[PDB]
Copies of this chain bind each other. A is one copy, B any other.
Amino acid sequence: SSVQTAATSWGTVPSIRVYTANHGKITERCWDGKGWYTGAFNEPGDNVSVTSWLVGSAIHIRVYASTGTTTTEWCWDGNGWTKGAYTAT
């Protein structure tokens, strides 16, 4: 079987973020042009998807972590991860 991943990137360097779901936990690895390192994101989930967008040169990331039938949105706007407003119904 296997872990499940999601990936996003931005800019021209680029920056890359890769999220991995394994045993109900999602972790994050990061590339900013030099090498890979572990990111701050660490939240529960069996499944993960991600999207991101720039405002000028500032990144915003949304990570959708699902356990069973519950999907939690996690927000990065440049200063820490927080739960977002997403609901499924």
Q: Does A80 contact B (CB under 8 A)?
A: no
Which chain B residue shows the least CB distance to A19?
B49
Cα distance, A35 to B7, chains bound together (Å):
25
Bitwise, A16-58 to B at CB < 8 A (1) or not (0) is: 1010101000000101000110100000011111111111000
30 A–B pairs (Cβ distance < 8 Å), ordered by A: A1-B46, A3-B68, A3-B71, A5-B47, A5-B49, A5-B66, A5-B71, A6-B49, A7-B49, A7-B50, A7-B64, A9-B51, A9-B52, A9-B62, A11-B53, A12-B53, A12-B55, A14-B53, A16-B51, A18-B49, A18-B64, A18-B71, A18-B73, A20-B66, A20-B71, A20-B88, A22-B69, A29-B86, A29-B88, A36-B85
